Design a protein around this ligand. Sequence first.
Ligand SMILES: [Mg+2]
Ligand SMILES: [Mg+2]
Ligand SMILES: [Mg+2]
Ligand SMILES: [Mg+2]
Ligand SMILES: [Mg+2]
Ligand SMILES: [Mg+2]
Ligand SMILES: [Mg+2]
Ligand SMILES: [Mg+2]
Ligand SMILES: [Mg+2]
Ligand SMILES: [Mg+2]
Ligand SMILES: [Mg+2]
Ligand SMILES: [Mg+2]
Ligand SMILES: [Mg+2]
Ligand SMILES: [Mg+2]
Ligand SMILES: [Mg+2]
Ligand SMILES: [Mg+2]
Ligand SMILES: [Mg+2]
Ligand SMILES: [Mg+2]
Ligand SMILES: [Mg+2]
Ligand SMILES: [Mg+2]
Ligand SMILES: [Mg+2]
Ligand SMILES: [Mg+2]
Ligand SMILES: [Mg+2]
Ligand SMILES: [Mg+2]
Ligand SMILES: [Mg+2]
Ligand SMILES: [Mg+2]
Ligand SMILES: [Mg+2]
Ligand SMILES: [Mg+2]
Ligand SMILES: [Mg+2]
Ligand SMILES: [Mg+2]
Ligand SMILES: [Mg+2]
Ligand SMILES: [Mg+2]
Ligand SMILES: [Mg+2]
Ligand SMILES: [Mg+2]
Ligand SMILES: [Mg+2]
Ligand SMILES: [Mg+2]
Ligand SMILES: [Mg+2]
Ligand SMILES: [Mg+2]
Ligand SMILES: [Mg+2]
Ligand SMILES: [Mg+2]
Ligand SMILES: [Mg+2]
Ligand SMILES: [Mg+2]
Ligand SMILES: [Mg+2]
Ligand SMILES: [Mg+2]
Ligand SMILES: [Mg+2]
Ligand SMILES: [Mg+2]
Ligand SMILES: [Mg+2]
Ligand SMILES: [Mg+2]
Ligand SMILES: [Mg+2]
Ligand SMILES: [Mg+2]
Ligand SMILES: [Mg+2]
Ligand SMILES: [Mg+2]
Ligand SMILES: [Mg+2]
Ligand SMILES: [Mg+2]
Ligand SMILES: [Mg+2]
Ligand SMILES: [Mg+2]
Ligand SMILES: [Mg+2]
Ligand SMILES: [Mg+2]
Ligand SMILES: [Mg+2]
Ligand SMILES: [Mg+2]
Ligand SMILES: [Mg+2]
Ligand SMILES: [Mg+2]
Ligand SMILES: [Mg+2]
Ligand SMILES: [Mg+2]
Ligand SMILES: [Mg+2]
Ligand SMILES: [Mg+2]
Ligand SMILES: [Mg+2]
Ligand SMILES: [Mg+2]
Ligand SMILES: [Mg+2]
Ligand SMILES: [Mg+2]
Ligand SMILES: [Mg+2]
Ligand SMILES: [Mg+2]
Ligand SMILES: [Mg+2]
Ligand SMILES: [Mg+2]
Ligand SMILES: [Mg+2]
Ligand SMILES: [Mg+2]
Ligand SMILES: [Mg+2]
Ligand SMILES: [Mg+2]
Ligand SMILES: [Mg+2]
Ligand SMILES: [Mg+2]
Ligand SMILES: [Mg+2]
Ligand SMILES: [Mg+2]
Ligand SMILES: [Mg+2]
Ligand SMILES: [Mg+2]
Ligand SMILES: [Mg+2]
Ligand SMILES: [Mg+2]
Ligand SMILES: [Mg+2]
Ligand SMILES: [Mg+2]
Ligand SMILES: [Mg+2]
Ligand SMILES: [Mg+2]
Ligand SMILES: [Mg+2]
Ligand SMILES: [Mg+2]
Ligand SMILES: [Mg+2]
Ligand SMILES: [Mg+2]
Ligand SMILES: [Mg+2]
Ligand SMILES: [Mg+2]
Ligand SMILES: [Mg+2]
Ligand SMILES: [Mg+2]
Ligand SMILES: [Mg+2]
Ligand SMILES: [Mg+2]
Ligand SMILES: [Mg+2]
Ligand SMILES: [Mg+2]
Ligand SMILES: [Mg+2]
Ligand SMILES: [Mg+2]
Ligand SMILES: [Mg+2]
Ligand SMILES: [Mg+2]
Ligand SMILES: [Mg+2]
Ligand SMILES: [Mg+2]
Ligand SMILES: [Mg+2]
Ligand SMILES: [Mg+2]
Ligand SMILES: [Mg+2]
Ligand SMILES: [Mg+2]
Ligand SMILES: [Mg+2]
Ligand SMILES: [Mg+2]
Ligand SMILES: [Mg+2]
Ligand SMILES: [Mg+2]
Ligand SMILES: [Mg+2]
Ligand SMILES: [Mg+2]
Ligand SMILES: [Mg+2]
Ligand SMILES: [Mg+2]
Ligand SMILES: [Mg+2]
Ligand SMILES: [Mg+2]
Ligand SMILES: [Mg+2]
Ligand SMILES: [Mg+2]
Ligand SMILES: [Mg+2]
Ligand SMILES: [Mg+2]
Ligand SMILES: [Mg+2]
Ligand SMILES: [Mg+2]
Ligand SMILES: [Mg+2]
Ligand SMILES: [Mg+2]
Ligand SMILES: [Mg+2]
Ligand SMILES: [Mg+2]
Ligand SMILES: [Mg+2]
Ligand SMILES: [Mg+2]
Ligand SMILES: [Mg+2]
Ligand SMILES: [Mg+2]
Ligand SMILES: [Mg+2]
Ligand SMILES: [Mg+2]
Ligand SMILES: [Mg+2]
Ligand SMILES: [Mg+2]
Ligand SMILES: [Mg+2]
Ligand SMILES: [Mg+2]
Ligand SMILES: [Mg+2]
Ligand SMILES: [Mg+2]
Ligand SMILES: [Mg+2]
Ligand SMILES: [Mg+2]
Ligand SMILES: [Mg+2]
Ligand SMILES: [Mg+2]
Ligand SMILES: [Mg+2]
Ligand SMILES: [Mg+2]
Ligand SMILES: [Mg+2]
Ligand SMILES: [Mg+2]
Ligand SMILES: [Mg+2]
Ligand SMILES: [Mg+2]
Ligand SMILES: [Mg+2]
Ligand SMILES: [Mg+2]
Ligand SMILES: [Mg+2]
Ligand SMILES: [Mg+2]
Ligand SMILES: [Mg+2]
Ligand SMILES: [Mg+2]
Ligand SMILES: [Mg+2]
Ligand SMILES: [Mg+2]
Ligand SMILES: [Mg+2]
Ligand SMILES: [Mg+2]
Ligand SMILES: [Mg+2]
Ligand SMILES: [Mg+2]
Ligand SMILES: [Mg+2]
Ligand SMILES: [Mg+2]
Ligand SMILES: [Mg+2]
Ligand SMILES: [Mg+2]
Ligand SMILES: [Mg+2]
Ligand SMILES: [Mg+2]
Ligand SMILES: [Mg+2]
Ligand SMILES: [Mg+2]
Ligand SMILES: [Mg+2]
Ligand SMILES: [Mg+2]
Ligand SMILES: [Mg+2]
Ligand SMILES: [Mg+2]
Ligand SMILES: [Mg+2]
Ligand SMILES: [Mg+2]
Ligand SMILES: [Mg+2]
Ligand SMILES: [Mg+2]
Ligand SMILES: [Mg+2]
Ligand SMILES: [Mg+2]
Ligand SMILES: [Mg+2]
Ligand SMILES: [Mg+2]
Ligand SMILES: [Mg+2]
Ligand SMILES: [Mg+2]
Ligand SMILES: [Mg+2]
Ligand SMILES: [Mg+2]
Ligand SMILES: [Mg+2]
Ligand SMILES: [Mg+2]
Ligand SMILES: [Mg+2]
Ligand SMILES: [Mg+2]
Ligand SMILES: [Mg+2]
Ligand SMILES: [Mg+2]
Ligand SMILES: [Mg+2]
Ligand SMILES: [Mg+2]
Ligand SMILES: [Mg+2]
Ligand SMILES: [Mg+2]
Ligand SMILES: [Mg+2]
Ligand SMILES: [Mg+2]
Ligand SMILES: [Mg+2]
Ligand SMILES: [Mg+2]
Ligand SMILES: [Mg+2]
Ligand SMILES: [Mg+2]
Ligand SMILES: [Mg+2]
Ligand SMILES: [Mg+2]
Ligand SMILES: [Mg+2]
Ligand SMILES: [Mg+2]
Ligand SMILES: [Mg+2]
Ligand SMILES: [Mg+2]
Ligand SMILES: [Mg+2]
Lengths: 117, 137, 151, 112, 52
Amino acid sequence: PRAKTGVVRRRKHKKILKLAKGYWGLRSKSFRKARETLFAAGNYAYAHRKRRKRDFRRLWIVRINAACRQHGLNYSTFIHGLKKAGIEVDRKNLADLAVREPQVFAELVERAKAAQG
Amino acid sequence: KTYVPKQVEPRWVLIDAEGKTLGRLATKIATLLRGKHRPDWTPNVAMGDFVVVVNADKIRVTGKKLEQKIYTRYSGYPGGLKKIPLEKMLATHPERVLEHAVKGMLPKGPLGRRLFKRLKVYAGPDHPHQAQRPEKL
Amino acid sequence: VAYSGRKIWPQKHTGRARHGDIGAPIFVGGGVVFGPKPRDYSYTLPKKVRKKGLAMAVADRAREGKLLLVEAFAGVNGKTKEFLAWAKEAGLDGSESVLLVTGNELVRRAARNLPWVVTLAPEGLNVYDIVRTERLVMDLDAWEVFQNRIG
Amino acid sequence: MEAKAIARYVRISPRKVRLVVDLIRGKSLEEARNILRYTNKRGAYFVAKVLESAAANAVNNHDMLEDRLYVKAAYVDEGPALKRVLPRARGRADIIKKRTSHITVILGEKHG
Amino acid sequence: AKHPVPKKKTSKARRDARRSHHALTPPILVPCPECKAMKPPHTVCPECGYYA
RNA sequence: GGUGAAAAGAACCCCGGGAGGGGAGUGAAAUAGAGCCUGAAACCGUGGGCUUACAAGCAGUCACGGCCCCGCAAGGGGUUGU
RNA sequence: UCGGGGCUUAAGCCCAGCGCCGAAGCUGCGGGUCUGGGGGAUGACCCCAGGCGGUAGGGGAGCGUUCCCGAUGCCGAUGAAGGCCGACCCGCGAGGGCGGCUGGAGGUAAGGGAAGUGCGAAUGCCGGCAUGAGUAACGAUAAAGAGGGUGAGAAUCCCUCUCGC
RNA sequence: ACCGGAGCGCUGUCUCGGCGAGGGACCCGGUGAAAUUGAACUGGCCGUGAAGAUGCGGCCUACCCGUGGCAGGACGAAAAGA
RNA sequence: AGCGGCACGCGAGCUGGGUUCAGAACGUCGUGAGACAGUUCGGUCUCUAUCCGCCACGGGCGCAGGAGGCUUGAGGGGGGCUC
Ligand SMILES: [Mg+2]
Ligand SMILES: [Mg+2]
Ligand SMILES: [Mg+2]
Ligand SMILES: [Mg+2]
Ligand SMILES: [Mg+2]
Ligand SMILES: [Mg+2]
Ligand SMILES: [Mg+2]
Ligand SMILES: [Mg+2]
Ligand SMILES: [Mg+2]
Ligand SMILES: [Mg+2]
Ligand SMILES: [Mg+2]
Ligand SMILES: [Mg+2]
Ligand SMILES: [Mg+2]
Ligand SMILES: [Mg+2]
Ligand SMILES: [Mg+2]
Ligand SMILES: [Mg+2]
Ligand SMILES: [Mg+2]
Ligand SMILES: [Mg+2]
Ligand SMILES: [Mg+2]
Ligand SMILES: [Mg+2]
Ligand SMILES: [Mg+2]
Ligand SMILES: [Mg+2]
Ligand SMILES: [Mg+2]
Ligand SMILES: [Mg+2]
Ligand SMILES: [Mg+2]
Ligand SMILES: [Mg+2]
Ligand SMILES: [Mg+2]
Ligand SMILES: [Mg+2]
Ligand SMILES: [Mg+2]
Ligand SMILES: [Mg+2]
Ligand SMILES: [Mg+2]
Ligand SMILES: [Mg+2]
Ligand SMILES: [Mg+2]
Ligand SMILES: [Mg+2]
Ligand SMILES: [Mg+2]
Ligand SMILES: [Mg+2]
Ligand SMILES: [Mg+2]
Ligand SMILES: [Mg+2]
Ligand SMILES: [Mg+2]
Ligand SMILES: [Mg+2]
Ligand SMILES: [Mg+2]
Ligand SMILES: [Mg+2]
Ligand SMILES: [Mg+2]
Ligand SMILES: [Mg+2]
Ligand SMILES: [Mg+2]
Ligand SMILES: [Mg+2]
Ligand SMILES: [Mg+2]
Ligand SMILES: [Mg+2]
Ligand SMILES: [Mg+2]
Ligand SMILES: [Mg+2]
Ligand SMILES: [Mg+2]
Ligand SMILES: [Mg+2]
Ligand SMILES: [Mg+2]
Ligand SMILES: [Mg+2]
Ligand SMILES: [Mg+2]
Ligand SMILES: [Mg+2]
Ligand SMILES: [Mg+2]
Ligand SMILES: [Mg+2]
Ligand SMILES: [Mg+2]
Ligand SMILES: [Mg+2]
Ligand SMILES: [Mg+2]
Ligand SMILES: [Mg+2]
Ligand SMILES: [Mg+2]
Ligand SMILES: [Mg+2]
Ligand SMILES: [Mg+2]
Ligand SMILES: [Mg+2]
Ligand SMILES: [Mg+2]
Ligand SMILES: [Mg+2]
Ligand SMILES: [Mg+2]
Ligand SMILES: [Mg+2]
Ligand SMILES: [Mg+2]
Ligand SMILES: [Mg+2]
Ligand SMILES: [Mg+2]
Ligand SMILES: [Mg+2]
Ligand SMILES: [Mg+2]
Ligand SMILES: [Mg+2]
Ligand SMILES: [Mg+2]
Ligand SMILES: [Mg+2]
Ligand SMILES: [Mg+2]
Ligand SMILES: [Mg+2]
Ligand SMILES: [Mg+2]
Ligand SMILES: [Mg+2]
Ligand SMILES: [Mg+2]
Ligand SMILES: [Mg+2]
Ligand SMILES: [Mg+2]
Ligand SMILES: [Mg+2]
Ligand SMILES: [Mg+2]
Ligand SMILES: [Mg+2]
Ligand SMILES: [Mg+2]
Ligand SMILES: [Mg+2]
Ligand SMILES: [Mg+2]
Ligand SMILES: [Mg+2]
Ligand SMILES: [Mg+2]
Ligand SMILES: [Mg+2]
Ligand SMILES: [Mg+2]
Ligand SMILES: [Mg+2]
Ligand SMILES: [Mg+2]
Ligand SMILES: [Mg+2]
Ligand SMILES: [Mg+2]
Ligand SMILES: [Mg+2]
Ligand SMILES: [Mg+2]
Ligand SMILES: [Mg+2]
Ligand SMILES: [Mg+2]
Ligand SMILES: [Mg+2]
Ligand SMILES: [Mg+2]
Ligand SMILES: [Mg+2]
Ligand SMILES: [Mg+2]
Ligand SMILES: [Mg+2]
Ligand SMILES: [Mg+2]
Ligand SMILES: [Mg+2]
Ligand SMILES: [Mg+2]
Ligand SMILES: [Mg+2]
Ligand SMILES: [Mg+2]
Ligand SMILES: [Mg+2]
Ligand SMILES: [Mg+2]
Ligand SMILES: [Mg+2]
Ligand SMILES: [Mg+2]
Ligand SMILES: [Mg+2]
Ligand SMILES: [Mg+2]
Ligand SMILES: [Mg+2]
Ligand SMILES: [Mg+2]
Ligand SMILES: [Mg+2]
Ligand SMILES: [Mg+2]
Ligand SMILES: [Mg+2]
Ligand SMILES: [Mg+2]
Ligand SMILES: [Mg+2]
Ligand SMILES: [Mg+2]
Ligand SMILES: [Mg+2]
Ligand SMILES: [Mg+2]
Ligand SMILES: [Mg+2]
Ligand SMILES: [Mg+2]
Ligand SMILES: [Mg+2]
Ligand SMILES: [Mg+2]
Ligand SMILES: [Mg+2]
Ligand SMILES: [Mg+2]
Ligand SMILES: [Mg+2]
Ligand SMILES: [Mg+2]
Ligand SMILES: [Mg+2]
Ligand SMILES: [Mg+2]
Ligand SMILES: [Mg+2]
Ligand SMILES: [Mg+2]
Ligand SMILES: [Mg+2]
Ligand SMILES: [Mg+2]
Ligand SMILES: [Mg+2]
Ligand SMILES: [Mg+2]
Ligand SMILES: [Mg+2]
Ligand SMILES: [Mg+2]
Ligand SMILES: [Mg+2]
Ligand SMILES: [Mg+2]
Ligand SMILES: [Mg+2]
Ligand SMILES: [Mg+2]
Ligand SMILES: [Mg+2]
Ligand SMILES: [Mg+2]
Ligand SMILES: [Mg+2]
Ligand SMILES: [Mg+2]
Ligand SMILES: [Mg+2]
Ligand SMILES: [Mg+2]
Ligand SMILES: [Mg+2]
Ligand SMILES: [Mg+2]
Ligand SMILES: [Mg+2]
Ligand SMILES: [Mg+2]
Ligand SMILES: [Mg+2]
Ligand SMILES: [Mg+2]
Ligand SMILES: [Mg+2]
Ligand SMILES: [Mg+2]
Ligand SMILES: [Mg+2]
Ligand SMILES: [Mg+2]
Ligand SMILES: [Mg+2]
Ligand SMILES: [Mg+2]
Ligand SMILES: [Mg+2]
Ligand SMILES: [Mg+2]
Ligand SMILES: [Mg+2]
Ligand SMILES: [Mg+2]
Ligand SMILES: [Mg+2]
Ligand SMILES: [Mg+2]
Ligand SMILES: [Mg+2]
Ligand SMILES: [Mg+2]
Ligand SMILES: [Mg+2]
Ligand SMILES: [Mg+2]
Ligand SMILES: [Mg+2]
Ligand SMILES: [Mg+2]
Ligand SMILES: [Mg+2]
Ligand SMILES: [Mg+2]
Ligand SMILES: [Mg+2]
Ligand SMILES: [Mg+2]
Ligand SMILES: [Mg+2]
Ligand SMILES: [Mg+2]
Ligand SMILES: [Mg+2]
Ligand SMILES: [Mg+2]
Ligand SMILES: [Mg+2]
Ligand SMILES: [Mg+2]
Ligand SMILES: [Mg+2]
Ligand SMILES: [Mg+2]
Ligand SMILES: [Mg+2]
Ligand SMILES: [Mg+2]
Ligand SMILES: [Mg+2]
Ligand SMILES: [Mg+2]
Ligand SMILES: [Mg+2]
Ligand SMILES: [Mg+2]
Ligand SMILES: [Mg+2]
Ligand SMILES: [Mg+2]
Ligand SMILES: [Mg+2]
Ligand SMILES: [Mg+2]
Ligand SMILES: [Mg+2]
Ligand SMILES: [Mg+2]
Ligand SMILES: [Mg+2]
Ligand SMILES: [Mg+2]
Ligand SMILES: [Mg+2]
Ligand SMILES: [Mg+2]
Ligand SMILES: [Mg+2]
Ligand SMILES: [Mg+2]
Ligand SMILES: [Mg+2]
Ligand SMILES: [Mg+2]
């Protein structure tokens, strides 16, 4: 029994080509170029996925530190007060309170300045 | 999901330069050029205050510096490397020395330039008395 | 393959690839690599196993209750319509596939053209045919033959 | 409505005639006849040929008003190329494609 | 062939961009006084003639 | 190597020197029109949406934002500015 | 040019202290798979602890292609195969399915059998089509010009005159 | 029409280049190849890295697209190093 | 009448005298075929530049109303000899 190639190759190809729609030039037209690009893409995503967290942690910090700065103290000491005052609550994300509901951030500042000494 | 600010208004600031240590001042100037002090900070927007500097011709700088310390420009041509000491910079256009400091302190991207334009430096005192002249130190 | 052994080109400073002759399997129209040759697929199954199977088939078919020894083939003389009558009055409504084993040549002819019936001489008893069919019907005499081999 | 007309298998390179077509896309039938009337390219003759036929079709087949129709769109497509062998130096030889075109012009009524 | 050769197939983008300035201009024409017809400026044209 | 069940293979009119088309007509289908069944990809082109002329690039990826588009609607698709 | 800007009781060097930042390490929450150990009489299933970077390579479990039995069967013009499209469902994945469009005559469950069974690279083979590019070239530097004619169309065909070899 | 040395005559071989002629190159109309080509959104310096970077780092520079030219680089093309 | 770097800069710029193919000979070594860094005469160097770089020249758009003319000079280049 002879088993020609037939549908098989074309179909596995069209799949990848779908995944590559949108890529520049030959990179979204040539199967061989498409796969290669995808290889890179997949790896990037998985690694940017890891970074994404590490990214926002940073953004938050600056915004927090910005609000702490105008409020007298700095980020370093602010966290310490909070970490000491047992207020593990504020996850550095939810310290977006600095942006909106500042009176609450303010309340949270004295709690930290209190825990200082 | 984290807060994104909308179209806000730039806070025009005014800093007196004379007396201030060159690099030290530039650092703060840079920070103001980005948000980084406003708790709604957003890394991809351009929201830093419009810093205005005056009396830049009177920036202080430790050590020998002025005598030594030299700025180098490079023309494309052979030998095209020019070298100019801090001394002669102030002799002529001096606002340069502060600019070249704040510029080198901004991020190198297309955004970096947008911000570098918000920095207005003058030999001072005096300048475009547009709106806000919020003294700052 | 019917080509010449001639080397297609020099294989040096030609700048082309590197080849021997059109016959080679990397060539289109060339020869096949490990394509099929003619061969014997048969083997010699242990006779004792062949027997057991024949028994277990008949047996399996007997436990189901679909086995049926007969004799009174009143519908002899090769004629389908006649055999139809006989099967009618015998519970073979043609609803179930029947392996009709018998030596009677005329009974054979009759049931033969029926789509639901596989005729068969007693010597031809084989587990395959047995299993293909739902019901098993066989001449008493033929059951003696089956018995001779195993019984 | 709109009136089509196509001349297929025109023995000329597509890239070449295409230069002429783009010259009259959207233009009114009037300035068009003129633009070809005095364009200095071989493609003119062919594009004019199909353009004028498009007109005839438009009126003799779709009651369209001649002095009221323009080039709603037009385009040229590549047909099967004629490959020929060109003897070269040192015995080398190569094929040259005498390409070919499919010129479509589709007219349309002005307004209403 | 001999000596200089292209290092890479020029992209679809590069080719067409080069052909930026390929587009030809339409002829310049003016209506002659004699007929309502069109003619290239500074040129006598058949189906009309000239005022001597 | 392949029109179609059948040649019924497109009369006649129109533009054209012709080729080739547009009407008409045949057929179940003409996107079955004659190298004619299905007709994938590279490749070429027309239209439309998003986008681009101070910007340094394995061409992506993560985020946010704008425009366009599908469910009036909480959603999703395309695009790409940073 | 210390990575740069830039820094001088320092943003340098040394001694001491407190706090913060920070990796895919560790924690939390959810999920997967393997192994061990527990109940489940029970097949199912749940609970607990632990392991899961990987080239050569060994082992295990699957996906799809052609063909055979299942076929005097079943699906098919109320549209088979194949094609194009999807933001939908199922699967860890290879894939499977559904919907829309095209297509127009075949297809082959469950369960098993047999192989010409899966391609991205071999300066691979065959075919198609691109790039260089409207580029080089149009093949002897003996040479042409004009009028008239023919024709859908003429520098290039015919005729006449003039010039040249 | 062998290889070495010298001298006379004469000269763009040269000091040292200039002008002119024709045939190409250039522009328009007609026809229209090739080797090469992982894909390209393809800059400089100083470093770095398999020790010789458009692709890594830092810094500098740079509006988008071409046409005629030059040949330093793409360890340029060609030939699975003679 | 400087020395050195730049693939002892530079052959997709040229040359090809030297070196390092096949011819031939002297000396020389080898029975020999041949050989030597010992010499000697002869000996085919590839029309088309895609990208970067470079010399020049344009098209596009930009410069918050549009246009004509005259300009400022940031930045860059040339020049710098000597008896
Ligand atoms: Mg295969
Ligand atoms: Mg493309
Ligand atoms: Mg494509
Ligand atoms: Mg954190
Ligand atoms: Mg600071
Ligand atoms: Mg500076
Ligand atoms: Mg930044
Ligand atoms: Mg950087
Ligand atoms: Mg820059
Ligand atoms: Mg033969
Ligand atoms: Mg043979
Ligand atoms: Mg033979
Ligand atoms: Mg052979
Ligand atoms: Mg042989
Ligand atoms: Mg041989
Ligand atoms: Mg042969
Ligand atoms: Mg060889
Ligand atoms: Mg090759
Ligand atoms: Mg080969
Ligand atoms: Mg071979
Ligand atoms: Mg061959
Ligand atoms: Mg064969
Ligand atoms: Mg054959
Ligand atoms: Mg065997
Ligand atoms: Mg025995
Ligand atoms: Mg009988
Ligand atoms: Mg009968
Ligand atoms: Mg009968
Ligand atoms: Mg039968
Ligand atoms: Mg039979
Ligand atoms: Mg039967
Ligand atoms: Mg029989
Ligand atoms: Mg039988
Ligand atoms: Mg034709
Ligand atoms: Mg257009
Ligand atoms: Mg024509
Ligand atoms: Mg008509
Ligand atoms: Mg009609
Ligand atoms: Mg076109
Ligand atoms: Mg073709
Ligand atoms: Mg030739
Ligand atoms: Mg040749
Ligand atoms: Mg060739
Ligand atoms: Mg070609
Ligand atoms: Mg394009
Ligand atoms: Mg295009
Ligand atoms: Mg027939
Ligand atoms: Mg016929
Ligand atoms: Mg017709
Ligand atoms: Mg008509
Ligand atoms: Mg007619
Ligand atoms: Mg003709
Ligand atoms: Mg016709
Ligand atoms: Mg009609
Ligand atoms: Mg019709
Ligand atoms: Mg169709
Ligand atoms: Mg359609
Ligand atoms: Mg025919
Ligand atoms: Mg035919
Ligand atoms: Mg045809
Ligand atoms: Mg198609
Ligand atoms: Mg087709
Ligand atoms: Mg296609
Ligand atoms: Mg396309
Ligand atoms: Mg398109
Ligand atoms: Mg388009
Ligand atoms: Mg739309
Ligand atoms: Mg600038
Ligand atoms: Mg990369
Ligand atoms: Mg978003
Ligand atoms: Mg958004
Ligand atoms: Mg809006
Ligand atoms: Mg709208
Ligand atoms: Mg979206
Ligand atoms: Mg992006
Ligand atoms: Mg430093
Ligand atoms: Mg800095
Ligand atoms: Mg200092
Ligand atoms: Mg000590
Ligand atoms: Mg001590
Ligand atoms: Mg101590
Ligand atoms: Mg200690
Ligand atoms: Mg501590
Ligand atoms: Mg910490
Ligand atoms: Mg860190
Ligand atoms: Mg992890
Ligand atoms: Mg974790
Ligand atoms: Mg877990
Ligand atoms: Mg678990
Ligand atoms: Mg797993
Ligand atoms: Mg394990
Ligand atoms: Mg277990
Ligand atoms: Mg346990
Ligand atoms: Mg158990
Ligand atoms: Mg159980
Ligand atoms: Mg129990
Ligand atoms: Mg058990
Ligand atoms: Mg676990
Ligand atoms: Mg690993
Ligand atoms: Mg299988
Ligand atoms: Mg297969
Ligand atoms: Mg088959
Ligand atoms: Mg069947
Ligand atoms: Mg039958
Ligand atoms: Mg169906
Ligand atoms: Mg029907
Ligand atoms: Mg259907
Ligand atoms: Mg249908
Ligand atoms: Mg289908
Ligand atoms: Mg298609
Ligand atoms: Mg849906
Ligand atoms: Mg579903
Ligand atoms: Mg599964
Ligand atoms: Mg599984
Ligand atoms: Mg799927
Ligand atoms: Mg499927
Ligand atoms: Mg699917
Ligand atoms: Mg249909
Ligand atoms: Mg079957
Ligand atoms: Mg199974
Ligand atoms: Mg099966
Ligand atoms: Mg199987
Ligand atoms: Mg199977
Ligand atoms: Mg199975
Ligand atoms: Mg099997
Ligand atoms: Mg095979
Ligand atoms: Mg392969
Ligand atoms: Mg073929
Ligand atoms: Mg073919
Ligand atoms: Mg061929
Ligand atoms: Mg090929
Ligand atoms: Mg192609
Ligand atoms: Mg081509
Ligand atoms: Mg080609
Ligand atoms: Mg081309
Ligand atoms: Mg041209
Ligand atoms: Mg030429
Ligand atoms: Mg010619
Ligand atoms: Mg020639
Ligand atoms: Mg003449
Ligand atoms: Mg006459
Ligand atoms: Mg005449
Ligand atoms: Mg005519
Ligand atoms: Mg003609
Ligand atoms: Mg004549
Ligand atoms: Mg001629
Ligand atoms: Mg002689
Ligand atoms: Mg002599
Ligand atoms: Mg002599
Ligand atoms: Mg004398
Ligand atoms: Mg004498
Ligand atoms: Mg002499
Ligand atoms: Mg001179
Ligand atoms: Mg002269
Ligand atoms: Mg000349
Ligand atoms: Mg010229
Ligand atoms: Mg030309
Ligand atoms: Mg870009
Ligand atoms: Mg670019
Ligand atoms: Mg250095
Ligand atoms: Mg490195
Ligand atoms: Mg080096
Ligand atoms: Mg380097
Ligand atoms: Mg890196
Ligand atoms: Mg770099
Ligand atoms: Mg640079
Ligand atoms: Mg130009
Ligand atoms: Mg040109
Ligand atoms: Mg150029
Ligand atoms: Mg070069
Ligand atoms: Mg001397
Ligand atoms: Mg000396
Ligand atoms: Mg030297
Ligand atoms: Mg030197
Ligand atoms: Mg060196
Ligand atoms: Mg050296
Ligand atoms: Mg050396
Ligand atoms: Mg030297
Ligand atoms: Mg040496
Ligand atoms: Mg040299
Ligand atoms: Mg050379
Ligand atoms: Mg040399
Ligand atoms: Mg060379
Ligand atoms: Mg010599
Ligand atoms: Mg030497
Ligand atoms: Mg040599
Ligand atoms: Mg020799
Ligand atoms: Mg010796
Ligand atoms: Mg010896
Ligand atoms: Mg010796
Ligand atoms: Mg010696
Ligand atoms: Mg020696
Ligand atoms: Mg000597
Ligand atoms: Mg000698
Ligand atoms: Mg000679
Ligand atoms: Mg020599
Ligand atoms: Mg010679
Ligand atoms: Mg010579
Ligand atoms: Mg020669
Ligand atoms: Mg050659
Ligand atoms: Mg030549
Ligand atoms: Mg070029
Ligand atoms: Mg390049
Ligand atoms: Mg280039
Ligand atoms: Mg350049
Ligand atoms: Mg320009
Ligand atoms: Mg310009
Ligand atoms: Mg003006
Ligand atoms: Mg004036
Ligand atoms: Mg003027
Ligand atoms: Mg100046
Ligand atoms: Mg000068
Ligand atoms: Mg100078």
